[PDB]
Amino acid sequence: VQEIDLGLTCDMHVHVREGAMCELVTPKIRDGGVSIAYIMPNLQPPITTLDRVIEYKKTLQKLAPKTTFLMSFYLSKDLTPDLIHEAAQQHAIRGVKCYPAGVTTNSAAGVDPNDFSAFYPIFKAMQEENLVLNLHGEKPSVHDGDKEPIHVLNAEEAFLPALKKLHNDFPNLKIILEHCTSESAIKTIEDINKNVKKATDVKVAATLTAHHLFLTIDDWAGNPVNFCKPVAKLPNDKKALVKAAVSGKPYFFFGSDSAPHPVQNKANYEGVCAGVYSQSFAIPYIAQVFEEQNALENLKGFVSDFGISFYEVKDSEVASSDKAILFKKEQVIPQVISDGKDISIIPFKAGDKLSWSVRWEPRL
Amino acid sequence: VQEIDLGLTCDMHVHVREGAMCELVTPKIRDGGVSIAYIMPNLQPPITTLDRVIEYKKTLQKLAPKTTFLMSFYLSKDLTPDLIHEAAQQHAIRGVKCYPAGVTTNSAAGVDPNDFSAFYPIFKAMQEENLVLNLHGEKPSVHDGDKEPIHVLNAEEAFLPALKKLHNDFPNLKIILEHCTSESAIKTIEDINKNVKKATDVKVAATLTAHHLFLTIDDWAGNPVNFCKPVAKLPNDKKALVKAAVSGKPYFFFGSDSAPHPVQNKANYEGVCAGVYSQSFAIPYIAQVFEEQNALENLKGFVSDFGISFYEVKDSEVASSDKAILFKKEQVIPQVISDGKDISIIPFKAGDKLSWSVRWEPRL
Ligand SMILES: O=C(O)c1[nH]c(=O)[nH]c(=O)c1F
Ligand SMILES: O=C(O)c1[nH]c(=O)[nH]c(=O)c1F
Ligand SMILES: [Zn+2]
Ligand SMILES: [Zn+2]
Ligand SMILES: [Zn+2]
Ligand SMILES: [Zn+2]
């Protein structure tokens, strides 16, 4: 069977929750073919204190000794530049994640992106310490008022001005538009990186999920299992995301936004939790897309090289030197992912066949 | 206003199912303030025979003696012009309802709207007999190679040409675009109706639901109770729909598309049954919108006059001459609507309070 050495794969947008759910999903990072994971902070309550981010990381390390964990804070008014400096100097975080209030899971304690001025001391501190600003790039929805309507389909586009202003005001701060879903955002990212020759010059980048390379509005209209934020959009939006994923440009790399929810939290007549679970087969899912696009030679950049460069991950910190090897053995995605206890999860593309599997081969 | 005599109210798009669901729902037509109901045929199996439509109507008259029932056939492959003539000749149907295959509930036995040709003999029979052609105006989805993609968001616009072609080929056939959801469809309807002041001259009309005058994509993205076909669209679309509902134009009238489903069929992680249940408070829902638009003087036209005119309902046919009186007593919508057995339904806007109630006054 054909094999591809992906090296030290990284997934820069991971949700692993807490408690039993965290015990179930955290080992799946390695099983899905991911060596390095950027852990998002939207817990109940959000991670805003040094003590809880340190304890949280250790909990993950206990659950997966071979997975490299990059941690983050949740952008909040509780944060202070002093806390940022202290946490950065103790190597306890690599970035801060911004949730606008109301747009997704555990975003109620989030920010109004019609401001982002109140957090400039925070960004100033983050810029000094080389920390990354991760953005959930969606404006809260507005329907009345002569300003024009913001809904789930244009909320990402409506956010692009805020991104451009932040990059302008903090030109040396590393910023990521997480999980791009629209062609407009892909273009905005390319235009921001127009004068860029070295991958190491990228200051604004974007992550792409597995599921936004497959899904359009039709797949989640009627299927909460496929509902997530930002929602999958129109067929042209999908096309633009795939071209970027296979483009080889250093400002687009893999972030799954694997967002596990127990099935009973998706099977609601009301208040369906947003979020798609892709961790268990993260890298194989991406392989399908690069295969169908005849672009397997670019797979390594999208899932390894560009994320390592952008986050400046050194062999000094990786918890295991094992390389993820993709081998072309068909498998079937199970119907559920379960701990054999209270938790059952419906995986992305449940019941479908993947061309590729993934294994771990030692180095040297 | 405190009281408004709405007269002989009309709901020209009603689903009452069969069995216990029907026993629960059919009396709610009257309790919702509706005197006249156009009954849709997408049962299992679809209503495609004279005998079945008679027993259905008879089942409904035993559950609601004071409700006037206009019945319909399901446009299927089993229909024949002779059946159309015979059914019209016995006053057993007032129209035939078209479902594109796969787009909505119990539509698997429906038609491909890219080849309506095979049903033209049916349309000549309907045209001679002055029956109405009700259209669920959505093309089935396609994400294929050459042709432009069709999804739940443009499927109604993608259907407008077929509507125009049908109007051109059968200029005397009364045709309704049921449940309009897009500004593009509103434009197409007015345009078709550009040279019409008499109101008996309208041949193509469109019904507007209760829920589409409130909902946008944001309200059903995470709330299956609000998922329906055609989906609620963008704020601009709602804007056109509300404007048309209150416009006083005779080519737009009320059809609820009240579509009852048991709660367990909305709380799926996949395959959520499309459909919003509005029957229990049909008229109060519409009252809210006309109040908020300072247009209560147009309420009677939208829920009574224009539908009676277009369907040519004569006092010969009405099962009760009782008048619907809207009185401003503010009530609260239950969280559930139940028969006290296996069936529970989440009503539209469950738990909200409505300014208006409705009662029945006899004619004297
Ligand atoms: O995209 C996100 O930010 C997000 N974050 C989450 O914690 N859960 C989600 O389900 C989700 F869609
Ligand atoms: O919109 C329709 O046509 C429709 N008809 C139905 O019978 N049930 C539905 O749930 C529905 F959405
Ligand atoms: Zn997000
Ligand atoms: Zn996320
Ligand atoms: Zn319909
Ligand atoms: Zn219907």
Residue numbers in the entry:
A (entry chain B), B (entry chain A): 2 to 365
List sentences quoted exactly from the publication behind this structure.
Dihydroorotase (DHOase) is a zinc metalloenzyme that catalyzes the reversible cyclization of N-carbamoyl aspartate (CA-asp) to dihydroorotate (DHO) in the third step of the pathway for the biosynthesis of pyrimidine nucleotides. Dihydroorotase (DHOase) possesses a binuclear metal center in which two Zn ions are bridged by a posttranslationally carbamylated lysine. Crystal structures of ligand-bound DHOase show that the flexible loop extends toward the active site when CA-asp is bound (loop-in mode) or moves away from the active site, facilitating the product DHO release (loop-out mode). In bacteria and yeast, DHOase is monofunctional and belongs to the type II enzyme.
Thus, we incubated 5-FOA with the crystal of the ScDHOase-malate complex and obtained the crystal of the ScDHOase-5-FOA complex successfully. The crystal structure of ScDHOase complexed with 5-FOA was solved at 2.5 Å resolution. An asymmetric unit of the crystal contained four crystallography-independent ScDHOase monomers. The global architecture of each ScDHOase monomer showed a TIM-barrel structure and consisted of 15 α-helices, 12 β-sheets, 2 Zn ions, and 1 5-FOA molecule. The dimetal center (Znα/Znβ) in ScDHOase containing 4 His (i.e., H14, H16, H137, and H180), 1 Asp (i.e., D258), and 1 carbamylated Lys (i.e., Kcx98) was still self-assembled. The structure revealed a long flexible loop in each subunit which extended toward the active site when 5-FOA was bound. For ScDHOase, the carboxylate group of 5-FOA ligated the Zn atoms rather than interacting with the positively charged side chain of Arg18 as that in EcDHOase and huDHOase. The bound 5-FOA by ScDHOase adopted the reverse orientation compared with those by EcDHOase and huDHOase. According to our structure, Arg18, Asn43, His262, Thr105, Thr106, and Lys230 of ScDHOase were involved in the 5-FOA binding. Despite having a similar active site, the 5-FOA binding pose and the conformation of the catalytic loop of ScDHOase for 5-FOA binding (via the loop-in mode) differed from those of EcDHOase and huDHOase (via the loop-out mode).
